[PDB]
Design a protein around this ligand. Structure first.
Ligand code: SF4
Lengths: 159, 270, 588, 92
């Protein structure tokens, strides 16, 4: 029937763990798209910000608390990888210790990127393994002929 | 896009379904399971006393009021076994303070209901629904009506806004340690609670089954819908009141109001 | 010129110190900091500080305390023989002057007497020196590691310690299991500060780490409770340490500029201003007037944005948040002007050494004029909504107040310090970037610093910033956006694309880096919060030898336990909200 | 009737629970001061006399209102007593 999949696509609960920076754009997104998000109740955790070595156990306890179906969105270059901070105090990506499903590059990403992350994540939730032999298609490959056909852009001396 | 308001709740209920349930270690198991249904079944069976129709009455029992008060009193046990099953002094004290303000603000509804059941003079709901034939029992009892409103919105309907958080430090909201289907059980419980409080309010204060120019069951349904929309409007308008201000405007202000309400109704009825 | 290397030996303080101590001990360095740098053996530190504290115009505020490695400097003309050093930057407000004191140390005897007795706010600074270096400060009350965890072996600011994470073992989760075992066994050894109270039923230890909103980052404040009273509060900071200072040593002068934008996420070009000013002081570059006015325009726009964020968050947390959410839309409009000028909403990275990246596009004046005519009506709506309100005003009076002396001793600058009676701005005392040809005032709170005084002062400063921004819109002159000097980095791009010598200068400036001669510069500005400064040391190469970033938020967050002692947890949260602290700034 | 609805409700409870299974020391000053709830335990018993009163008041008449006023006046005196002594105040 696959009604359960529609159930999971239609409704998702976001756990906002945005850190010092990079969360002002996430708030910009959240106040337009949406006190509902609560610990040990959500199934989606939007990791944003620079994952620091000191606070990584906090993210590991919050990952442990949530239920069996766990989804994680990494936002920003500082969370996908170490980003610009390849330094002793920054872990080189959040995927080192928790599995990640969707990666959203940027520094900081835009609210529209968050919107497209929810769209690609309901699209992934609607094809079930989890890969299902459908996720090999990539945005690098899907819009490639769209992007290559671009020729002219407005000159940058204008507003 | 989804065109129905309820479809969001439908998807939410489906989501809460088929979620793995985890056992808590070093915890009691019977109360961890039983605390949701003390909150759910109480306001589910609060629906069993409404005269929705003379021919489709859900229960033709002689007393419905006492059953409602028995469920109102029983509801606290759900917050208490939830507090003890939290097994965290922070969350336990959060549920202790929530049950505190609950017992504090549950006092008023019985004394407010005494006015309408005294001018009605019976516990069988057929007598109440036949009493509001020409004059409804809302014109004289404004104070009783608003006191019952405050009491009805004060029973774990989120108007106090201390359920999932705590203004006072060292403690935490008691909806945290439940994360499986029991959380959906909480939401459906407050949903049946708000609709049953609205239905009881319309059928006990105003006049159900009047039918001025249209069949009376849809008249009852539309009036209930208007009071639903007004309840949601004032719930949204109502800001979060901190614990102190709630304690200040509790037993001091509305116990005298309902006592003079009983005096007024007893003086005017004879 | 205003950039030439001076000794300041003629300064009166040099002659007073020469009279009191006679000869010897003092080596007068030659620098372009504008202030007198003096070396003082470690046996005289307490004497020198005590004399300066009571001097007839005293140095009331300890601006900064930190250390320098100094081991690899080949250009060492005039300095005494040092293998390590610790510098103490002090400021006399009544003199509007500064003094820098450097204590030299040898590698075998890394010991220096603690300076906390004179100025208590130095305590955490010395703690950082124990963490980042291996200097032990005898007489320190709580000498523990403040940035890395307590089992981290190695001192990250030593040059024998590899800077980048790649040189260490990757996140193999060897430490996740050990940190999990440690966190599960959460017990108190009473080593987290003084911890005078014993661990029993009498005193309760509570981490009290606010993860809720408006916390300005996740941090822990270990609290001792007795009768629901704050017996002792000890912050546990350092969670958001990004190693910016260590990063400054391995990046060129040009490619470091993006990192400045992230010292404070809300600052943007304010964080870039002191860095470019210090680098151009090392280069000896005088910029044209158009560069100055452009820099003032961008800095006043970001300052307005920061003030609007502080006002909005304050009115939302302790008041009615329904009307002030329109300011969120207004912030988007401020952003559409910034990304019209610079390109990107946050982290512009637009200031360059010697100028800016491009000129303003030709439709800038109409957009700024539309923002300047539109804003005042909203500003007056907030002025009526905030001056005339009674509920939060009544609530927000006398809540953990302190006076001028209290602010002075605790190094607290900014709106906190302006709330007391000390009239001290750097834009009037030490004009920079052409502020001396503009008319603006510094509001002041009197003698009591609380939340109402801070918001009223912030609104008055926002009005002065809007007056500066309209004067910048009406008197922007014509001419170049980049100085004419071989060290202006990068060259004008149209010149790079056509002229061989300009192309070569651009080639070596963007690839190897510009060669700045070996010297030390220092600049402080008025930031969105307090006074932010940059102390840069170059060894003659294309990279910084030492980068020190003084952020006021570190002092503002260090000050809370001294003032909030004797209050409730609610007063603690209200004070934490009131104080202008951001975790990114505290941990740099 | 009520019995049929109760059987339906308990059958639904059994169905949901079975379906769910198949689906797969010292507090010091903290807490204490529940005595507001004890005041409720006693005051509900006071108001239970009004619960029994509210059914039959038309045949009670003037002495009924008189002694109900005396009763609630005694309750009001006790309430203002508890307020003025400091028992009913801010509570944890
Ligand atoms: S991704 Fe960008 S905005 Fe986000 S934390 Fe990293 S540097 Fe800051």
């Amino acid at each position: 029937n696959d009604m359960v999949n529609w159930g999971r696509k239609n409704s998702i609960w976001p756990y906002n763990f945005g850190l010092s920076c990079c969360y002002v754009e996430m708030v910009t997104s959240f106040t337009a798209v949406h006190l509902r998000a609560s610990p040990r109740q959500a199934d989606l955790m939007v990791v944003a910000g620079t994952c620091f070595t000191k606070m990584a156990p906090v993210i590991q306890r919050l990952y442990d608390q949530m239920l069996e179906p766990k989804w994680v969105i990494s936002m920003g270059a500082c969370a996908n990888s170490g980003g610009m901070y390849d330094i002793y105090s920054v872990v080189q990506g959040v995927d080192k210790f928790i599995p990640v499903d969707v990666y959203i590059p940027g520094c900081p990403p835009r609210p529209e990127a968050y919107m497209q992350a929810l769209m690609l994540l309901q699209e992934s939730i609607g094809k079930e393994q989890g890969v299902y032999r459908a996720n090999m298609q990539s945005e690098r490959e899907r819009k490639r002929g769209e992007r290559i056909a671009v020729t002219n852009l407005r000159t940058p001396d204008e507003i | 896009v989804g065109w129905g308001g309820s479809l969001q709740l439908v998807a939410d209920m489906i989501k809460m379904f088929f979620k793995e349930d985890w056992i808590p270690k070093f915890s009691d198991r019977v109360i961890f399971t039983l605390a949701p249904m003390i909150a759910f079944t109480s306001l589910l069976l609060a629906f069993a006393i409404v005269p929705v129709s003379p021919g489709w009455v859900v229960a033709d029992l002689n007393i419905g009021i006492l059953f409602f008060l028995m469920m109102a009193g029983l509801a606290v046990y759900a917050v208490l076994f939830a507090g003890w099953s939290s097994n965290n002094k922070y969350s336990l004290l959060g549920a202790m303070r929530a049950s505190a303000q609950t017992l504090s603000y549950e006092v008023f509804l019985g004394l407010s209901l005494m006015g309408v059941v005294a001018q009605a003079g019976s516990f069988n709901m057929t007598d109440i629904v036949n009493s509001q034939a020409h004059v409804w029992n809302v014109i004289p009892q404004f104070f009783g009506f608003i006191t019952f409103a405050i009491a009805g919105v004060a029973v774990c309907h989120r108007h106090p806004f201390d359920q999932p958080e705590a203004e006072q430090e060292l403690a935490d909201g008691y909806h945290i340690e439940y994360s499986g289907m029991k959380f959906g059980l909480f939401f459906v419980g407050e949903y049946i609670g708000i609709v049953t409080i609205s239905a009881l309010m319309v059928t006990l204060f105003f006049g159900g089954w009047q039918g001025p120019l249209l069949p009376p069951f849809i008249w009852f349904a539309l009036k209930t819908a208007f009071f639903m929309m007004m309840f949601i409007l004032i719930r949204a308008s109502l800001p979060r009141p901190r614990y102190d201000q709630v304690m200040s405007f509790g037993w001091k202000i509305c116990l005298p109001l309902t006592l003079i309400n009983l005096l007024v109704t007893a003086a005017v009825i004879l | 010129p205003a950039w030439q290397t001076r000794d300041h030996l003629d300064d009166p303080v040099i002659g007073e110190l020469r009279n009191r101590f006679g000869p010897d001990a003092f080596t007068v360095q030659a620098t372009r900091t504008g202030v007198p740098v003096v070396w003082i053996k470690r046996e005289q530190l307490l004497e020198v500080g005590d004399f300066l504290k009571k001097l007839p115009k005293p140095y009331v505020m300890l601006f900064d305390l930190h250390g320098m490695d100094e081991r690899l400097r080949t250009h060492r003309e005039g300095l005494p023989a040092a293998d390590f050093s610790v510098f103490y930057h002090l400021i006399s407000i009544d003199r509007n002057r500064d003094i820098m004191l450097k204590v030299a140390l040898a590698e075998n005897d890394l010991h220096v007497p603690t300076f906390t007795k004179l100025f208590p706010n130095a305590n955490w600074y010395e703690r950082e020196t124990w963490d980042l270096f291996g200097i032990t400060f005898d007489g320190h009350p709580n000498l523990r590691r403040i940035m890395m965890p307590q089992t981290w072996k190695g001192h990250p600011l030593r040059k024998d310690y590899p800077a980048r994470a790649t040189e260490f073992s990757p996140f193999e989760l060897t430490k996740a299991k050990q940190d999990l075992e440690m966190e599960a066994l959460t017990f108190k050894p009473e080593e987290w500060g003084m911890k005078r109270g014993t661990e029993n039923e009498d005193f309760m230890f509570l981490n009290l780490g606010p993860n809720h909103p408006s916390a300005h980052g996740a941090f822990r404040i270990v609290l001792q409770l007795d009768g629901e009273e704050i017996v002792d509060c000890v912050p546990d900071i350092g969670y958001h340490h990004r190693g910016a200072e260590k990063m400054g040593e391995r990046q060129s002068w040009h490619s470091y500029i993006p990192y400045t934008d992230r010292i404070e996420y809300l600052g943007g070009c304010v964080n870039e201003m002191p860095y470019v000013l210090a680098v151009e002081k090392l280069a000896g570059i005088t910029v044209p007037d158009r560069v100055n006015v452009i820099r003032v325009m961008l800095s006043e726009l970001f300052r307005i944005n920061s003030h609007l964020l502080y006002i909005s968050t304050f009115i939302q947390d302790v008041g009615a948040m329904t009307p002030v959410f329109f300011a969120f839309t207004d912030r988007q409009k401020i952003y559409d002007l910034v990304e019209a000028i610079t390109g990107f909403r946050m982290h512009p990275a637009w200031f360059r050494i010697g100028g800016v990246a491009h000129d303003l596009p030709r439709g800038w004046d109409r957009l700024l004029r539309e923002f300047l005519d539109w804003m005042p009506k909203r500003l007056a709506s907030y002025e009526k909504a905030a001056l005339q309100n009674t509920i939060l005003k009544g609530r927000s009076q006398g809540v953990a107040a302190y006076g001028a002396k209290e602010a002075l001793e605790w190094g607290t600058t900014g709106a906190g310090l302006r709330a007391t009676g000390i009239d001290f701005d750097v834009r009037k005392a030490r004009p920079y970037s052409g502020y001396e040809n503009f008319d603006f005032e510094i509001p002041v709170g009197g003698g009591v610093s609380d939340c109402y005084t801070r918001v009223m002062l912030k609104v008055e400063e926002l009005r002065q910033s809007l007056r500066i921004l309209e004067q910048c819109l009406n008197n922007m002159p014509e001419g170049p956006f980049k100085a004419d000097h071989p060290l202006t980095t990068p060259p004008p791009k149209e010149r790079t694309l056509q002229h061989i010598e300009t192309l070569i200068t651009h080639f070596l400036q963007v690839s190897w880096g510009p060669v700045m001669p070996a010297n030390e510069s220092f600049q402080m500005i008025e930031a969105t919060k307090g006074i932010n400064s940059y102390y840069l040391t170059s060894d003659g190469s294309t990279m910084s030898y030492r980068t020190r970033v003084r952020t006021p938020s570190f002092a503002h967050l260090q000050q809370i336990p001294a003032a909030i002692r004797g209050s409730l947890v609610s007063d603690l949260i209200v004070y934490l909200g009131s104080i202008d602290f951001v975790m990114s700034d505290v941990d740099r | 009737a009520f019995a049929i609805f109760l059987i339906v409700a308990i059958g639904l409870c059994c169905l949901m629970l079975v379906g769910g299974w198949f689906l797969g020391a010292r507090l010091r000053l903290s807490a204490k001061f529940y005595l507001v709830a004890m005041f409720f335990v006693i005051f509900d018993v006071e108001a239970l006399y009004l619960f029994a009163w509210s059914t039959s008041i038309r045949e009670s008449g003037w002495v009924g209102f008189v002694e109900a006023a005396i009763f609630i006046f005694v309750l009001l005196a006790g309430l203002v007593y508890l307020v003025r002594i400091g028992a009913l105040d801010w509570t944890p």
